[PDB]
Design a protein around this ligand. Structure first.
Ligand SMILES: C#C[C@@H]1N[C@@H](C)[C@@H](O)[C@H]1O
Length: 438
């Protein structure tokens, strides 16, 4: 045991109702909206292939010139109520919103900088409009916050002098102020998801990360805080020097997911994954033909994968400069929505089932020990292999949509062949099992 003052706080998984809710939600959407939406990946006639929200970096644009985009910020098609309806129709139980990205432009009228929605032609408090609209639909709201801030010159990448230390100490107070502001202006917030905490300046200031966590939990009862915020005394991030998880949930699976056979360790803690529709674009990019774009079933597969291993999944959207969503994103949300409406009993409020992974797809476990087989790969054998843990038998199988009974044949001790449905469902589908222990 190494002694640590700013290491892990939590024991195991939080089991208060607020965390249970965060967990049971399972499916979320991510919104990346900021000034980067205006150029849409293009600067000075040149289209850059990197992530559009990092365009300031790719095109080497100075802060003053970048933040001048505020003068064109006028999303006349924006309508918080439509956005919330879209999220509702997709089947998302929560939404995570970029309050401020690396660029430093704030979607709420912060008192602590001039780079906010207030100083734009649009003027209005976008974030407040969204919080109300989503909450009205019964959708929880979570706040993305970039610690790294390219708009504030007291920011430092590292601490190489007392001068740097002085500047950065001012920067951390500025940050605390924005955070307190967010927590008190918008007290229904359920989570803060920190990003841009990877620089050596932050790694050297673990105490501040632990402080930010404590500060926000005092202000917002039951609020959740991601692991990404946190560094310990030694600069170890996410998990501390004694290997204990910091924050309330693990938050490293970004555009990738744990292996279903090798990474079972993740079922021991809460966690949340996020993903993009193209290969790597979070903010709006005008040309999606530049990388592979996932199909709905590919996205659905990742959602169920996450849940099968006891984690949440958040699918990202990068709204247009005008405040509307591109056609591809509307189609995606609608498709995910249709499927969740039919099969979401195997997703919402479900968890790791403790069964050995099989090739046809994923198991999930319901709140009353339902075991759901979510089938993505249809075997030509017409038989779906189910190997049970010790002491578990399978008493019945049922097609979720129709209620029809599905033949279960015992092949060996602890193994069965569950038949495919008489009629091929033509899409990833669910069979529900009734199981019994000894
Ligand atoms: C890097 C990086 C950032 N982290 C992802 C969640 C996006 O915000 C991306 O731009």
């Amino acid at each position: 045991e190494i002694p640590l003052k700013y290491g892990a706080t939590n024991e195991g998984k939080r089991q208060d109702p607020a965390m249970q809710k965060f967990r049971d939600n399972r499916l979320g959407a991510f919104i990346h909206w900021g000034l980067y939406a205006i150029p849409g990946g293009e600067w000075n006639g040149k289209v850059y292939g990197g992530a559009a929200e990092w365009l300031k970096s790719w095109a080497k644009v100075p802060a003053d010139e970048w933040l001048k985009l505020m003068d064109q910020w006028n999303p006349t098609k924006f309508d918080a109520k439509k956005w919330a309806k879209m999220a509702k129709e997709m089947g998302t139980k929560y939404v995570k919103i970029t309050t401020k990205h690396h660029e430093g432009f704030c979607l709420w009228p912060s008192k602590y900088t001039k780079y906010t929605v207030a100083n734009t032609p649009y003027k209005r408090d976008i974030l407040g409009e969204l919080v109300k609209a989503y909450n009205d639909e019964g959708i929880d709201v979570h706040f993305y916050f970039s610690v790294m801030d390219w708009s504030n010159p007291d920011y430092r990448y590292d601490i190489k002098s007392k001068e740097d230390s002085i500047a950065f100490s001012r920067f951390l107070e500025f940050t605390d102020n924005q955070l307190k502001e967010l927590a008190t202006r918008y007290p229904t917030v359920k989570d803060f998801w920190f990003d841009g905490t990877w620089d050596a300046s932050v790694k050297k200031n673990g105490w501040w990360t632990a402080h930010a966590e404590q500060m926000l939990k005092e202000l917002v009862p039951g609020v959740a805080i991601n692991s990404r915020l946190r560094a310990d005394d030694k600069g170890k991030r996410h998990f501390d020097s004694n290997g204990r998880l910091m924050g309330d949930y693990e938050s490293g699976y970004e555009r990738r997911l744990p292996d279903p056979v090798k990474d079972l360790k993740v079922t021991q803690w809460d966690w949340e994954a996020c993903m993009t529709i193209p290969e790597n674009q979070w903010g709006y990019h005008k040309d999606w033909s530049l990388s592979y774009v996932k199909t709905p079933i590919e996205v659905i597969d990742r959602i169920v994968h996450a849940v099968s291993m006891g984690g949440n999944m958040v699918v990202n959207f990068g709204p247009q400069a005008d405040g509307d969503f591109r056609p591809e994103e509307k189609a995606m949300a609608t498709a995910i929505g249709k499927w969740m409406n039919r099969y979401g009993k195997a997703v919402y409020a479900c968890d790791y089932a403790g069964f050995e992974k099989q090739d046809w797809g994923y198991y999930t476990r319901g709140k009353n020990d339902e075991v759901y087989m979510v089938v993505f790969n249809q075997p030509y054998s017409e038989r779906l292999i189910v190997k049970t843990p010790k002491g578990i038998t399978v008493e019945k199988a049922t097609l979720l949509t129709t209620g029809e009974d599905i033949t279960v044949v015992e092949t060996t001790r602890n193994e069965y062949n569950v038949s495919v449905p008489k009629k091929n469902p033509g899409e990833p589908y669910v069979i529900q099992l009734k199981v019994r222990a000894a």
